[PDB]
Amino acid sequence: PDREKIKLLTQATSEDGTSASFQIVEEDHTLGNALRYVIMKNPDVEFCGYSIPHPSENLLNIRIQTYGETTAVDALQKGLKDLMDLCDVVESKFTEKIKSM
């Protein structure tokens, strides 16, 4: 139960969800940009974007804003799962081609 990995930044969070800043430690542009792309491919998301506040801190604030349908937490979970599925597909294709050649 890692409670220090991803945090909800309450000052930058709206009422009834739909807008939230998540602080993810030990992450950088690698996860940030892929997560932003996947989340932006979600039709309910109106605003996705991450910032690394300082290069001296292993930190990542990712801002998700949605319309009234779903919440930013829901969108973030969906984006993470969709990145998982993307990596599954890439793994399967790469393994198949490496086997075939």
Binding site: T95, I98, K99, S100, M101
Partner: peptide, 17 residues
Amino acid sequence: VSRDTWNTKNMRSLEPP
């Protein structure tokens, strides 16, 4: 080449230290 190594081998190094 053209042979999988990840399927057979347990990726111990990919665990978080």
